[PDB]
Amino acid sequence: PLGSMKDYDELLKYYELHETIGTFAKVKLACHILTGEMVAIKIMDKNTDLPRIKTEIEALKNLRHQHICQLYHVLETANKIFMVLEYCPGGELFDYIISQDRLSEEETRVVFRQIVSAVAYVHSQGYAHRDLKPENLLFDEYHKLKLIDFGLCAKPKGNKCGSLAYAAPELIQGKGSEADVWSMGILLYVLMCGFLPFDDDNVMALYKKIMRGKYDVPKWLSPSSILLLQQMLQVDPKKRISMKNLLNHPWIMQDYNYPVEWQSKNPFIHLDDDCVTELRQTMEDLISLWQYDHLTATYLLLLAKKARGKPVRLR
Numbered sequence: 001p002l003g004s005m006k007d008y009d010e011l012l013k014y015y016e017l018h019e020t021i022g023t024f025a026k027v028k029l030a031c032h033i034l035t036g037e038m039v040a041i042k043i044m045d046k047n048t049d050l051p052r053i054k055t056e057i058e059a060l061k062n063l064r065h066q067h068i069c070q071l072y073h074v075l076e077t078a079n080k081i082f083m084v085l086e087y088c089p090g091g092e093l094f095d096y097i098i099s100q101d102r103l104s105e106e107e108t109r110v111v112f113r114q115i116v117s118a119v120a121y122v123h124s125q126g127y128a129h130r131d132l133k134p135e136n137l138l139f140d141e142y143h144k145l146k147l148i149d150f151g152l153c154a155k156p157k158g159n160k161c162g163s164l165a166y167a168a169p170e171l172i173q174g175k176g177s178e179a180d181v182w183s184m185g186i187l188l189y190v191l192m193c194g195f196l197p198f199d200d201d202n203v204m205a206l207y208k209k210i211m212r213g214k215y216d217v218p219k220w221l222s223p224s225s226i227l228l229l230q231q232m233l234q235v236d237p238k239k240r241i242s243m244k245n246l247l248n249h250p251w252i253m254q255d256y257n258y259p260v261e262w263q264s265k266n267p268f269i270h271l272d273d274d275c276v277t278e279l280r281q282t283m284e285d286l287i288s289l290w291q292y293d294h295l296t297a298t299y300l301l302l303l304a305k306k307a308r309g310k311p312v313r314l315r
């Protein structure tokens, strides 16, 4: 509630602000001046959950995946915190499901394999999203999914929440990795049905439906889909299917005949030659630091500009 325009001084030196596109914090579309690439900037007012956005930043600095919304630049003033992120024009998965009522099994698989790829990578780095829901999955320009909102993420094996409808029965009991598998199971159901497996007007009724684990199985669901849903939506976390068995699951393997490529194609070590070749050893040393300043943003967007096919240049 300060309303200061001086906080935008450092930001406008690298980006051109446009319109507001997304929702607590405020999200605005912007254009990286040096590269010309479009970006999404999240703006948090420090006077208006601070440790929640601090959790997301710390995670996105260590996480880099083709199905995770990339963090380009972090800028903090005296009153605001700016987060320059990958721009996803396709919008929420949630909105896509509503517009299409429900997705076919084939359509779902294309989408779901990208979700599995992201979450498997997240778990491999010792993280757990803990808030998997269709609102937190965005389509990019190539209509591929990008996982967002790591504000509630945590390290299950580290030092010492989300939507109830996607919460694992263990979380309701008040008892980490297997929790995300459950949520993906809920996601799988919604994708192919268009509605939640567990839903109710009353909160206690809802949480009770979840812990029972009983849900309707629509007639349009194939037995293969039915089997996988059972394996993911096991009320007992120990009985729930592991990430490893999910990667090469028969349902997943259908029409593809190869396991989900969860490995990150977005490295920290290997730098691009064309992107570096500008303005060598001194330049590469600066990029490898990854301070997530203007340099990190410039390089990653220059690499994105290169992956787009556009000329590796700076306006």
Ligand SMILES: c1cc(-c2cnn3cc(-c4ccc(OCCN5CCCCC5)cc4)cnc23)ccn1
Binding pocket: 021, 022, 027, 040, 042, 069, 085, 086, 087, 088, 089, 090, 091, 092, 138, 148, 149
């Ligand atoms: C991290 C990242 C983001 C974010 C990054 N890109 N991004 C993009 C959007 C967004 C982009 C475009 C939008 O318009 C949707 C238009 N729809 C698209 C579907 C077909 C009909 C027309 C709606 C939302 C929203 N949030 C983000 C938001 C919050 N936290």
